[PDB]
């Protein structure tokens, strides 16, 4: 299962639009995301290629045309459904970053990424997970560094009604922190919610996304009465999963257009998304 069998993993993402409703003056746009993995006992080698920048040009605020690949490694100390201790350390490398050094056009930034893979079972149906996203910025100078130490806790819970369709609930908890002397002023803690429920049907996968939709003060759920019919105003992300058998995983991204801020710059750049993940 997990000792010396070697697990091959490879994925590929792609972002494309509808070539605009009226007109066509854009050929090259967005770039594909490469992914690679290898499971060898308590060491999982993951190599992904990150590159973004079709033919855009800003010059002034920031720059992201160089880009580069990334590295990831997993190390599970103990393997137990009762108390599983894991640790996935990854290395991120970004090109350009910011012009300042009169020597190289692009600069390389170093960032650490650890995730204490914590797994604990409570019952014979519900599962408990815990991922702590830790980001550590590092460079060959660091004028200011912006932040100091990033720490985000994620509590995922996957429970299936009767061994089949399980609902996933991840609770994000990000908080600011600095190594100052005695000047904190008064930071704030941001908590993001995440609702999910990966379902399958023989040879078809469907995992929707949820988080927000309404807002009230006093309200309670019903028992005899149900609000399930299909006449409610909501978005709910749609993630389709095809194949998941032949060896190649085909994913699909769907999401209509809603909400806005700019009167021309648009809120988002893309709506649909195609990505695959072949593992075996």
Swiss-Prot record:
Forms channels functionally larger than those of classical porins. GO terms for biological process: carbohydrate transmembrane transport; monoatomic ion transport. It comes from Escherichia coli (strain K12). Monomer. Its main location: membrane. GO terms for cellular component: cell outer membrane; pore complex. Gene3D superfamilies: monomeric porin ompg (2.40.160.40). Coiled coil: none annotated. It comes from the Bacteria. The gene is ompG. SUPFAM superfamilies: Porins (SSF56935). InterPro entries: Bact_OM_Channel_sf, Outer_membrane_porin_G. The chain crosses the membrane at residues 6-14, 26-36, 43-51, 68-77, 83-91, 108-115, 128-137, 151-161, 165-174, 180-188, 192-201, 209-217, 219-227, 233-244, 248-258, 268-279. It holds the Pfam family Porin_OmpG. Keywords: Cell outer membrane, Ion transport, Membrane, Porin, Signal, Transmembrane, Transmembrane beta strand, Transport. This is Outer membrane porin G.
